[PDB]
Design a protein around this nucleic acid. Structure first.
Ligand SMILES: [Mg+2]
Ligand SMILES: [Mg+2]
Ligand SMILES: [Mg+2]
Ligand SMILES: [Mg+2]
Ligand SMILES: [Mg+2]
Ligand SMILES: [Mg+2]
Ligand SMILES: [Mg+2]
Ligand SMILES: [Mg+2]
Ligand SMILES: [Mg+2]
Ligand SMILES: [Mg+2]
Ligand SMILES: [Mg+2]
Ligand SMILES: [Mg+2]
Ligand SMILES: [Mg+2]
Lengths: 216, 53, 168, 109, 51, 63, 176
RNA sequence: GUUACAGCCCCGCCCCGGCAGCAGCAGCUCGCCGAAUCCCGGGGCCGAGGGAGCGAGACCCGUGCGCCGCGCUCUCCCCC
RNA sequence: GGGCCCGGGGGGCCACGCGUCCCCCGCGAGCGCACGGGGUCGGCGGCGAUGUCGGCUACCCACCCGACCCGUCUUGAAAC
RNA sequence: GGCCGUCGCUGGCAGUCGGCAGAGCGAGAAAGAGAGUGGCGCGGACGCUACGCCGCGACGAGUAGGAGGGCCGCUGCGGUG
């Protein structure tokens, strides 16, 4: 019985600790921490008491089984993967969603969600784009930012809030959340000159415009 | 070399020092110092051509 | 002036192919265990070895390798001739199981034995299968002439490290 | 309300002089004519759009006659802003000198 | 066994050479310390450009 | 390419008896097991000789 | 030799290895212009085998280091004494260049001997490179740059970068 | 003609005169390198194999993240 | 420089027990992390009953690259 | 790096040894998870046509010619289905 300390030596490089194991032996203080030395349930029957069996043996065996497979190690499921971002996508940046039905719309970034997706809302007043998820890869990042650091994005909306159910009818919670985030963002994009007209516009490549050449 | 190795193997057996008896190819020559004691090295020049024939 | 010791160890890479080779050149190339193009071996130098490398100079490129070249060759292209089979050096138990009778029990013992050419260089080297190196990235200058006359054959002394890194 | 792709020409296949290796395609993206500028397009998804006789299904829409072969810009070719691309089905030689679309969307910005 | 590269994989290297752990722990500490000394000498040189 | 002569890579030594008689093949099934599972070199020689032809196991007279 | 890249200049010294006949053999030094130190040691043994009864296996190289330019920011006048095989006969030349470094002037000499006389690097033996005062120069192409008030336009500036606009609209200017 | 209203070159004495700095982010004035070498990132192609067991013992029949390999916390006690 | 950097008067260490004597000056346990004996997700999105989905191979056509007619005798055959 | 075959290791497996039980023989270091005598719950995949199954390495041009394997093909006979 004890409270857990954190890991003493810092992550110097990935997989390499900053302190060697003698300095770590001294830091843990191991010099003074030496040490030396269901399947059955009885049930009454109205007979006697039977001893019933939990997980009784199977009644059907298929004509052939596959063998078990070996043990790999670094193969985590999706809900335990590490979630990256770019350095160019920061909360407040303006993005260009490229692929969906909102192609080319200049649209405001809110937060990195739990599944890695971008909570992304270029306002429903301007873009006609809701509180919507997008993907990091399928988004170009414009270097045009708002100081959104002082808004209260709600805690209840997360990756399970935007995941599909099964005619899609707009619930009232979508409207209330859209308003409660829209009214917090929209004065900060009105506080910048001509940013709302930039958000109403759509992105288009035109003649002599090459994406390797024009910077944003 | 048979006779000399018999002499070198009977000797240094009671003494116990291990003595090399196989021949060995000519090694790379070991590091050494070269003394330019006083004088500098003489500068060599390609000679110009002159047609003796 | 300090004249350093003449180098005891050479990495020999075969640069020319398998077609149209003289019988004495073919015999010496198969005594150095160079049976493909871009195969490599470590050779210790002495009067016998240097004349064997003189007799096959157009077909080999060789020089005097670095310590880092020994490190990358043993760690990345390092395989062992275990039970007359090419088995990858992925554990020190493999090196110990064959060469432990020479007190060579880890990868570092074998690297020390190859680089600082030891008493048991023959067995640590013959434990190593010939190195299977790729084509030189960037390329060759010219395969057919000597390094001195602007090519790649022959002794390129310290400069074999630029081509080990180019090939390994 | 505009163009969301870049204009590339399917120049030819990856070839030696007397051998062509048609699993790899060669693409000439418009406006890039050096290897310094081709670093943008590597890994971007390329597409050969073409229209045929019979209706085929469209994801998110009604059946049209337009079809595609999707690709991937793999690595730079040559020294002058040419590039290699590798598609799921190898491109027809019907498409030599015709337009393929190099999309922006596998973005690295 | 899949030959993993010891020059890439840190732990295949540590399975083969455990002293590479301290050869690599040193020269992270060494190089960061020398980079601190480089920045500090540059800051003293800029102060001497002021002074 | 590699310069090995593939001339003598196949060793023509006898792997199994050419006879189809079932008792000799049962004795071979017994000594295959004894040859790979004992450390003895008797069983290798006896396994080898149960493969060989009639002219390679000649009759041994009584004397 | 393949006179490749830029030549470097080397101080290669060496000697015959000692016998009990001569206990301490004398050291011989040369100035080798070479791409690298390996071909510089080879070119050393070339000229030493010509001048002495000395081969590589009966001798040794004691020092081989690059000698740098002691003034690489001064434009200087180099006179190079040549020896080259023609198609017919071999010839002696004096020849003048004007570079910052001696290795640069000898690189320029190899390019110019290959240019004018179609002679390749194995024909050419550099025997003497000497930096030369501006009053002692013999060749007029070098002497015309010895003007304190030198002044000239860049008259007909043919433009490069021709394919960056492959298809331009204005014809290019060439007067600048 | 010889410092004058520009400069260049050499020698001697000044601590190799001294202060940077240092094969230079004056991001190219000229090299060889890395046990004297490490970190991070981007693109491409691939994913073959498939009963590796762990702990609990004849005082028990559990369970499949198991070897080698690296090191994390707790079985001491405080402080921020 | 080398001697475990011989010996005496702020950083790092594959260094950690108690006692007896000569000489020199063999069982601690558990729990998570993982560059660790070859890929998985305990992540998803669309379209589908009269006009669409799949079907490499086999039917026809087109394009790019390739490509002379087989047997034979011969040193050599697409051979006038 | 994947797959096909060949060759080699004359490599591995008869150990499917189960309340008549104890699940191992990859491991740098000639040889034993030896036997002795004094001080509740009834369970545990696949396999092995051993002419079979399995695992490692390297290798693969071919005329004339040689040899092997064909669960390639034709016609009749003894058996069998
Ligand atoms: Mg040839
Ligand atoms: Mg390249
Ligand atoms: Mg030739
Ligand atoms: Mg053959
Ligand atoms: Mg044969
Ligand atoms: Mg054609
Ligand atoms: Mg005929
Ligand atoms: Mg005839
Ligand atoms: Mg004829
Ligand atoms: Mg014919
Ligand atoms: Mg004819
Ligand atoms: Mg082959
Ligand atoms: Mg064949």
């Amino acid at each position: 019985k004890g409270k857990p300390h954190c890991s003493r030596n810092p992550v110097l490089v990935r997989g390499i600790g900053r302190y060697s194991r003698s300095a770590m032996y001294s830091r843990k203080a191991l010099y003074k921490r030496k040490y030396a030395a269901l399947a059955t349930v009885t049930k009454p029957v109205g007979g006697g008491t039977r001893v019933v069996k939990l997980r009784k043996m199977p009644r059907y065996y298929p004509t052939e089984d596959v063998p078990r497979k070996l043990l790999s190690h670094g193969k985590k499921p999706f809900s335990q993967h590490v979630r990256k971002l770019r350095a160019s996508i920061t909360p407040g940046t303006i993005l260009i969603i490229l692929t969906g039905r909102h192609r080319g719309k200049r649209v405001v970034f809110l937060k990195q969600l739990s599944s890695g997706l971008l909570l992304v809302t270029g306002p429903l007043s301007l873009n006609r784009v809701p509180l919507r998820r997008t993907h990091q890869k399928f988004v170009i990042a414009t270097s045009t930012k708002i100081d959104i650091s002082g808004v209260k994005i709600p805690k209840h909306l997360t990756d399970a809030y935007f995941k599909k159910k099964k005619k899609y009818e707009i619930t009232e919670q979508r409207k209330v959340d859209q308003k409660a985030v829209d009214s917090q963002i929209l004065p900060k994009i009105k506080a910048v000159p001509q940013l709302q007209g930039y958000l109403r516009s759509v992105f288009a490549l035109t003649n002599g415009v090459y994406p390797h050449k024009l910077v944003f | 070399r048979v006779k000399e190795n018999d002499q070198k193997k009977k000797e240094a057996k009671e003494k116990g020092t291990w003595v090399q008896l196989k021949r060995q190819p000519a090694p790379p020559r070991e590091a050494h110092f070269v003394r330019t004691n006083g004088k500098e090295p003489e500068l060599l020049e390609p000679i110009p051509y002159e047609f003796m024939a | 002036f300090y004249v350093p010791a003449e180098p005891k160890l050479a990495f020999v890479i075969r640069i020319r192919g398998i077609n149209g080779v003289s019988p004495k050149v073919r015999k010496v190339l198969q005594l150095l265990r160079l049976r493909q193009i871009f195969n490599g071996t470590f050779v210790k130098l002495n009067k016998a070895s240097i004349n064997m490398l003189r007799i096959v100079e157009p077909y080999i490129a060789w020089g005097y390798p670095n310590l880092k070249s020994v490190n990358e060759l043993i760690y990345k292209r390092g395989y062992g001739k275990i039970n007359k089979k090419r088995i990858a050096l992925t554990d020190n138990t493999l090196i110990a199981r064959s060469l432990g009778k020479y007190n060579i029990i880890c990868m570092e013992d074998l690297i020390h034995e190859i680089y600082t050419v030891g008493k048991h260089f023959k067995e640590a080297n013959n434990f190593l299968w010939p190195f299977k190196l790729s084509s030189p990235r960037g390329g060759m200058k010219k395969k057919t002439t000597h390094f001195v006359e602007g090519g790649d054959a022959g002794n390129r002394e310290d400069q074999i490290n630029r081509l080990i890194r180019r090939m390994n | 309300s505009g163009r969301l792709w870049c204009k590339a020409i399917f120049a030819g296949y990856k070839r030696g002089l007397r051998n062509q290796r048609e699993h790899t395609a060669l693409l000439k993206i418009e406006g890039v004519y050096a290897r310094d500028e081709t670093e943008f397009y590597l890994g971007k998804r390329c597409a050969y759009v073409y229209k045929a006789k019979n209706n085929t299904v469209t994801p998110g829409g009604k059946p049209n006659k337009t079809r595609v072969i999707w690709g991937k810009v793999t690595r730079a070719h040559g020294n002058s802003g040419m590039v290699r691309a590798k598609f799921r089905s190898n491109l027809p030689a019907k498409a030599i000198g015709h337009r393929i679309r190099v999309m922006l969307y596998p973005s690295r910005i | 066994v899949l030959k993993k590269n010891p020059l890439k994989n840190l732990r295949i290297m540590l399975k083969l050479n455990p002293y590479a752990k301290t050869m690599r722990r040193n020269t992270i500490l060494r190089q960061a310390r020398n980079h601190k000394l480089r920045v500090e000498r540059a800051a003293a040189a800029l102060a001497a450009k002021s002074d | 390419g590699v310069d090995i002569r593939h001339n003598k890579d196949r060793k023509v030594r006898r792997k199994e008896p050419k006879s189809q008689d079932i008792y000799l093949r049962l004795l071979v099934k017994l000594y295959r097991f004894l040859a790979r599972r004992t450390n003895s070199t008797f069983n290798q020689v006896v396994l080898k000789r149960l493969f060989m032809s009639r002219t390679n196991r000649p009759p041994l007279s009584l004397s | 030799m393949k006179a490749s890249g830029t030549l470097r200049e080397y101080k290669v010294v060496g000697r015959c290895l000692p016998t009990p006949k001569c206990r301490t053999p004398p050291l011989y030094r040369m100035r080798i212009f070479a791409p690298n130190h390996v071909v510089a040691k080879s070119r050393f043994w070339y000229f030493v085998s010509q001048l002495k009864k000395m081969k590589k296996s009966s001798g040794e190289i004691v020092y081989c280091g690059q000698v740098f330019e002691k003034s690489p920011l001064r434009v200087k006048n180099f006179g190079i004494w040549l020896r080259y095989d023609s198609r017919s006969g071999t010839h002696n030349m004096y020849r003048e260049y004007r570079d910052l470094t001696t290795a640069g002037a000898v690189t320029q000499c190899y390019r110019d001997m290959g240019a004018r006389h179609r002679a390749r690097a194995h024909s050419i033996q550099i025997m003497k490179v000497e930096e030369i005062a501006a009053s002692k120069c013999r060749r007029p192409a070098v002497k015309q740059f010895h003007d304190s008030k030198i002044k000239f336009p860049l008259p007909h500036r043919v433009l490069r970068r021709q394919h960056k606009p492959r298809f331009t609209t204005k014809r290019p200017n060439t007067f600048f």
